[PDB]
Enzyme design. Structure first.
Site, short mmCIF file in Angstrom:
data_model
loop_
_atom_site.label_atom_id
_atom_site.label_comp_id
_atom_site.label_asym_id
_atom_site.label_seq_id
_atom_site.Cartn_x
_atom_site.Cartn_y
_atom_site.Cartn_z
N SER A 73 32.21 -2.30 116.19
CA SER A 73 30.93 -2.60 115.59
C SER A 73 30.29 -1.27 115.56
N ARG A 74 30.08 -0.73 114.35
CA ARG A 74 29.81 0.68 114.20
C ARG A 74 28.32 0.87 114.21
N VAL A 75 27.57 -0.22 114.41
CA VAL A 75 26.14 -0.23 114.34
C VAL A 75 25.68 -1.30 115.28
#
Lengths: 120, 169, 120, 116, 265, 253, 48, 168, 116, 85
Positions: free
Chosen positions: F204-206
């Site tokens: 989950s890059r955010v």
């Protein structure tokens, strides 16, 4: 209990009478015998379990009565009938081998075997 | 690519993996062919490189066997040892032409197995030095290789002696 | 089937043979109609054509069809679009096998490969 | 056999099978090695290698491209030459003496050449 | 292509699998004979040990090690190499005699100084008295074995049919035989040179056993290894099968696109 | 993730969980979740409805439906319309969620439409404007600013990979558009991990900022630890050292 | 010649009527080349 | 063939090879600008092959039992059963006999590869005598195939028995 | 070499060669164990596995997401760091130590962390 | 061979060795060199001319160019007019 063994067989691995050909001449073991270490010379060997008797032709080895009454016999090859004419042919060759020829010593061993054969 | 391959008189296939392997130029020798073939190379250079193609091909075959990890007999490892040296011989950093007079010795040395001895790591050092040695001593020999461009009996012997002379480096 | 189910109330089971040949047939009719075939040459109406067939088949209040289909997978490829679309419609799979039949078991159903999603 | 004669056919049949066996065994030979195959196979491989390089018959126009002098080997003679090798009549002759030479006669001469 | 290069590569993987399967099976066969031999050998050894035990023991140095020439007999070669190396730390003055190419290579690398005698060609058949005797004779002549005040041999004791432990034992010198605590509960003969004979006799009798124990472990290791190989190959078959299938779909699609583009015009 | 791993259930659980916040007060805590069912059996949808009514969760959720019976253009317009409904909630300031199950079927739908409109096929036969189609849909999910009344509309789009081909054209196009992935591994699913979350392909890059501090502190480095477990069991099947074993014992447990 | 070498030669001779199994024949003759080494340096292999 | 079949007689029609038939339909369709299809073979190529191959029929007794046995021949390009024209025909037909080049080279002539030969009617129309004496044969060859790779030393007596029987 | 420097070019060359080897033997590694690799190769492979792991540097703008405070290592430092690693100087320490950390100094420190 | 594996450089090496004959005399032993660069960025070309000027090989080179920006018809025409040269 007797132990008789070869690298490629096991023959008796006490047994009533065993007659053995040794550096010390011939040695007999009957029931308990006192503990010995004897190198077996190239040999004719007899093992008797009761009156039944088995006759072995033996390439020399080692004999050791253990102090626990284990007669460890270890030798390279043992049936005397199997050894028994082709050997006579070889004996002629072996005489020839002594003529030309460590190889000399080898041919001497062949002479020892020739004597061993004469017993048969 | 298919169209062009048919049209052209030779193909000089390169291989990306061999670039990474550090073979520069990265010429993939097995895929590289010249259909018109020898009659457009120096006569001397033809002589020295006579079995160079065969050796390299044998090296390739052997190399495959070697990577299946099967036990390699000494004869196979003669090929392998020769093969390795040849591969290192091929290498040559960009933007550095080399005259035939100084390519004939290196290939002679390799094909005549003088390289087989010397350690793989320092083959490049040996190459640089060998050329320097010929420049020093047998520069007469080099002049002749340039001038007549074919190795005569005398030149083959001279060259043979020269390589031997610097075979201990 | 729908007449039995809806208008005679009777639950029915409608077998289809190769549903591969349903797909295959559909692909041809599309191509004949001049509609550009989609990936792996399967009709642009691939989703919809299966969709009409496989949603008519359903559980009504009146009755219910249940359908056993035979899927002749093309070149044993399951990632081919025709299988993929088929598997979407399928709810359970009964996986008859010849190995099982060779263990003398008829039913031929392979127990470890038979799976249902209504096994829940 | 009905066309090119039974003898021609038989010789060639022996060549074809031998080579095909050899190709099949190559994968096996690659990892396992030569000493894991049958004894018969090991001789067949040796023969196949002899046959394989017997196929290298120099061209007469490859004098120009290389230097190898071509050997125009007669048909009757060629049938004979292959037969001998397969029969093992020249399986005492090294594998490399079949390379880049003509018929059996040439192979015998080339055997002498290697011998010297 | 992609397609053909995949397909041939998948074939390569298939062929590799087939060979590893085959090898594993043949290995099992070979293993059965090996084990049969090992029993008879071990029985002989136990009798010899009967003397040494009852006698008690009380034993630069010699190192003897046993491996086969051939590879692909698991990690016998390198587990043994490691344990030799462990005891090469212990005695820096140890002269290594290598029986087998695989151990020969690894130790030769670790110290090339120590390699004094080495053998070759052992592994083809299971150990035989003939081999051992000759090796013994050369060990005595070439290495003058008695001079080393320690002799130790490393071999692989085949702990379980699925395990192998590299193991070592000390071969008992003629000096050892002489002063062995009980040597008076055996009838030595002064005229006979029973120590100089018995030393030699147990040099071989023990050594043959060590070789036998090892050989069974090696062939067993090869069986184990080739089994694991087949499994690894199987996984690769599955992985490349997915690649093949993907590539196959792609070829159909890409070709189709070319046809369509033409038709559209 | 991979086809019919009961893919829907993973998302469904999110819908269910939000019920102590959804039956909670505070409009930020009240998510109103829309489940867009595209290309799904009338039966499957009926089960979903019944499931939602079983967990009594229907009252906080909308179902938009575009079954596979429904016509291909309807399916094409099905996500776009649904997103409008979601935007009304978002622009009502209220927080919401929309799960678009499965966009892989939207791709097939747009493919059909395009082909029947005869615009020449794109890569994998999916039309060349497929990137635009997905991107316009996808970026309509947002956390708005204080100016806009702090709107929210979370988005979980459900992508059906064919055969675990994680390089497939439709999936890759989606992966590049979206941030984060929750790749679900079939092998693990088969080997009884429900929910089968392959942490190797889940990112989950955010996401990290969103986490409540309690669940950052307690869970600190566990992603790292279990990305040591993967490595550990990678080289477990060579020799195992006690350090490796301790990690493995912890990891497995 | 060692004691066990002495016995060995005798055993080999002893394998002479014929009846001799393969294990006997292998036990009688075997091929090997003992590769003597020095320091690296290698006195080249010679049949055992 | 139909005339013979109609007379209730028997006959065998050997279509050799439908692969060239395929090419001809391809030529016609492409030249007539009819919609192209898979592997650049005409869109209805499945339909063509199916029409031909369904004509072959063992007639009913009402139609005074007759037959028109058929044996289509398909030429595989690189042995690709994957290829579109082979796949279609394979599906349509009822059994296959698969000749194999490797076997031909290995001198087995006919070079029929037993494994890849199948009959879906098969033993139903086998001579009773011949059926009796060749159930065993199928099984032996099956084993011979499995034990084929074992032909590389220390080989079980059972495997060796299989090998002798199988090779012969 | 003319550009960055001969030392840089030499270092990079070696890195490339080791890694290319590691990829080359990637097939063999999968098919059969690491203990079925040649001794010379086994060293190379072990070095290369370390090099591969060494190359990861956590990023400073990814620090939030990864949760690892990033690193930035000087170019002059980098050439040195890999140079040492190629000579196996610090190679004798865990693969985990190399993994996801910055400069040579950082690896050394993480070895101490691991050592505890 | 695969793109930009110093693809330009292999050919450039040929140009460099042609310094040896060029420097000399006898034009039948000389090769004048025409390097045609089609479709390459202006910067790439600029590097090429710089290398050639550095090795002073532009004392015998002709560079026929049709950079990437320059029109596709001109690019099509570019090999054939290089041939004419």
């Amino acid at each position: 209990k007797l132990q008789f063994a070869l690298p490629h067989e096991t023959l008796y691995s006490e047994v009533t009478q065993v007659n053995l050909p040794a550096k010390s001449g011939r040695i007999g073991v009957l029931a308990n015998h006192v503990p010995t270490v004897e190198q077996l010379l190239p040999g004719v060997v007899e093992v008797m379990e009761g009156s039944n008797s088995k006759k072995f032709f033996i390439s020399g080895g080692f004999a050791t009565v253990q102090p626990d009454s284990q007669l460890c016999v270890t030798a390279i090859e043992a049936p005397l009938e199997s050894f028994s004419e082709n050997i006579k042919n070889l004996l002629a060759e072996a005489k020839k081998n002594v003529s030309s020829s460590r190889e000399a010593a080898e041919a001497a061993i062949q002479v020892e075997v020739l004597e061993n054969l004469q017993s048969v | 690519p298919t169209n062009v391959i048919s049209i052209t008189d030779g193909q000089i296939f390169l291989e990306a993996e061999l670039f990474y392997k550090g073979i520069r130029p990265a010429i993939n020798v097995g895929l590289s062919v010249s259909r018109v073939g020898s009659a457009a190379q120096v006569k001397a250079l033809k002589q020295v490189a006579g079995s160079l193609k065969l050796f390299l091909a044998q090296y390739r075959e052997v190399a495959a066997f070697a990577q299946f990890g099967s036990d390699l007999d000494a004869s196979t490892k003669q090929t392998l040892v020769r093969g390795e040296r040849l591969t290192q011989l091929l290498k040559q950093n960009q933007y550095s032409p080399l005259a035939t007079e100084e390519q004939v010795p290196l290939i002679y040395a390799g094909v005549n197995g003088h390289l087989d001895g010397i350690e793989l790591s320092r083959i490049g050092e040996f190459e640089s030095s060998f050329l320097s040695y010929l420049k020093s001593n047998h520069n007469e020999l080099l002049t002749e290789i340039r001038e007549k461009g074919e190795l005569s009996k005398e030149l083959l012997a001279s060259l043979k002696s020269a390589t031997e002379s610097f075979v201990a480096t | 089937a729908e007449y039995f189910r809806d208008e005679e109330g009777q639950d029915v089971l409608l077998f289809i043979d190769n549903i591969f040949r349903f797909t295959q047939a559909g692909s041809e009719v599309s191509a004949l109609l001049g509609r550009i075939p989609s990936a792996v040459g399967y009709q642009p109406t691939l989703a919809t054509d299966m969709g009409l067939l496989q949603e008519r088949i359903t559980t009504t209040k009146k009755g219910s069809v249940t359908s056993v289909q035979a899927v002749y997978v093309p070149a044993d490829d399951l990632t081919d679009p025709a299988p993929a679309t088929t598997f979407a419609h399928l709810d359970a799979t009964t996986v008859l096998s010849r190995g099982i039949s060779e263990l003398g078991i008829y039913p031929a159903v392979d127990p470890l490969d038979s799976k249902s999603r209504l096994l829940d | 056999a009905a066309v090119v004669g039974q003898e021609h056919y038989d010789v060639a049949s022996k060549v074809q099978e031998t080579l095909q066996t050899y190709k099949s065994l190559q994968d096996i030979i690659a990892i396992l090695g030569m000493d894991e195959l049958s004894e018969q196979d090991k001789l067949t491989v040796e023969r196949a290698r002899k046959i394989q390089r017997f196929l290298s018959q120099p061209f007469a126009v490859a004098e120009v491209f290389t230097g190898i002098p071509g050997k125009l080997v007669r048909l009757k003679d060629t049938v004979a030459s292959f037969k001998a090798v397969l029969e093992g009549k020249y399986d005492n002759i090294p594998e490399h003496a079949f390379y880049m030479v003509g018929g059996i006669e040439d192979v015998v001469a080339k055997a002498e050449k290697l011998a010297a | 292509a992609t397609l053909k290069e995949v397909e041939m590569r998948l074939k390569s993987i298939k062929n590799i699998e087939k060979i590893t399967k085959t090898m594993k099976i043949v290995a099992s066969t070979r293993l059965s004979k090996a084990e049969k031999a090992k029993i008879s050998a071990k029985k002989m050894d136990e009798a010899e040990q009967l003397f040494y035990k009852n006698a008690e023991t009380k034993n630069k140095e010699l190192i003897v090690a046993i491996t086969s020439d051939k590879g692909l007999c698991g990690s016998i070669h390198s587990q043994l190499a490691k344990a030799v190396r462990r005891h090469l730390n212990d005695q820096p003055n140890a002269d290594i005699v290598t029986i087998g190419d695989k151990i020969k290579m690894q130790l030769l690398r670790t110290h090339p100084n120590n390699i004094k005698l080495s053998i070759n060609g052992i592994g083809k058949d299971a150990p035989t008295f003939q081999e051992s005797a000759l090796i013994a004779d050369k060990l005595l002549s070439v290495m003058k074995a008695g001079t080393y005040p320690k002799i130790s041999i490393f071999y692989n004791d085949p702990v379980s049919s699925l395990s192998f432990e590299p193991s070592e034992k000390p071969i008992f010198n003629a000096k050892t035989i002489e002063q062995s605590p009980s040597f008076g509960k055996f009838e030595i003969d002064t005229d006979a040179n029973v120590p100089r004979d018995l030393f030699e006799y147990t040099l071989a009798n023990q050594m043959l056993t060590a070789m036998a124990q090892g050989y069974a472990a090696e062939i067993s290791a090869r069986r184990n290894a080739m089994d694991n190989a087949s499994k690894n190959a199987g996984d690769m078959i599955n992985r490349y099968s997915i690649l093949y299938n993907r590539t196959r779909q792609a070829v159909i699609t890409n070709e189709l696109v070319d046809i369509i583009t033409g038709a559209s015009s | 993730g991979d086809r019919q791993t009961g893919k829907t259930a993973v998302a469904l659980d999110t819908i269910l969980n939000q019920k102590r916040w959804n039956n909670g007060s505070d409009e930020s805590k009240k998510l109103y979740c829309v489940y867009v069912a595209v290309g799904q059996k009338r039966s499957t949808v009926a089960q979903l409805v019944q499931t939602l009514e079983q967990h009594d969760a229907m009252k906080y959720s909308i179902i938009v439906a575009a079954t596979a019976s429904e016509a291909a253009p309807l399916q094409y317009l099905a996500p776009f319309t649904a997103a409008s409904i979601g935007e009304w909630f978002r622009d009502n300031g209220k927080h919401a969620l929309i799960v678009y199950d499965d966009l892989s079927k939207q791709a097939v739908a747009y493919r059909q439409l395009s082909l029947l409109l005869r615009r020449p096929p794109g890569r994998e036969a999916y039309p060349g404007d497929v990137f635009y189609l997905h991107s316009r849909l996808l970026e309509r999910a947002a956390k708005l600013s204080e100016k806009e009344g702090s709107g929210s509309l979370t988005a979980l789009p459900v992508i059906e990979t064919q055969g675990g081909d994680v390089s497939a054209y439709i999936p890759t196009n989606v992966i590049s558009i979206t941030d984060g992935q929750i790749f679900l591994e079939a092998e693990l699913f088969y080997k009884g991990i429900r929910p089968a979350i392959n942490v190797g392909l889940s990112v989950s890059r955010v996401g990290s900022a969103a986490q409540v501090k309690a669940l950052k502190q307690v869970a600190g480095s566990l992603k790292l630890f279990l990305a040591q477990y993967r490595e550990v069991a990678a080289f477990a099947q060579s020799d195992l050292d006690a350090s490796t074993k301790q990690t493995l014992v912890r990891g497995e447990r | 010649i060692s004691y066990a070498a002495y016995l060995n030669v005798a055993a080999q001779a002893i394998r002479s009527t014929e009846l001799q199994t393969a294990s006997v024949l292998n036990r009688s003759q075997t091929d090997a080349f003992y590769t003597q080494y020095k320091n690296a340096s290698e006195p080249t292999p010679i049949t055992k």
